[PDB]
Write a protein that binds this ligand. Sequence first.
Ligand SMILES: CC(=O)N1c2ccc(-c3ccco3)cc2[C@H](NC(=O)OC(C)C)C[C@@H]1C
Length: 107
Amino acid sequence: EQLKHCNGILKELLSKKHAAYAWPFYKPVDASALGLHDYHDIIKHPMDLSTVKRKMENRDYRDAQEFAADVRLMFSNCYKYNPPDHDVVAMARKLQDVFEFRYAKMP
Ligand SMILES: CC(=O)N1c2ccc(-c3ccco3)cc2[C@H](NC(=O)OC(C)C)C[C@@H]1C
């Protein structure tokens, strides 16, 4: 019911319209490839949109709140790991505003 609306939100976050700032969240952070040695010490519970998508498809979310908690975890990890002036942080804030807008307007 509210879960079905969550699918629409996720689709919005992954759509072309937001690609210029969403693209770094499309896949799990690869610490080795990016050369962030300490990412997995600092970030204990990694998250990204393709993981949210899988969990949605497998019906791992029992309600809208659990879905929101994973999306917020993704943004929180980013703010936690990266300095406040980093470009990826500015990208996260823009994507999060889209997310909090759609989540707040859900019936
Ligand atoms: C989402 C997130 O917290 N990160 C992330 C994730 C993916 C990629 C990445 C790069 C290529 C594919 O994925 C890069 C980063 C960031 N480093 C960076 O130059 O970001 C630019 C967008 C300014 C570092 C950070 C660990």
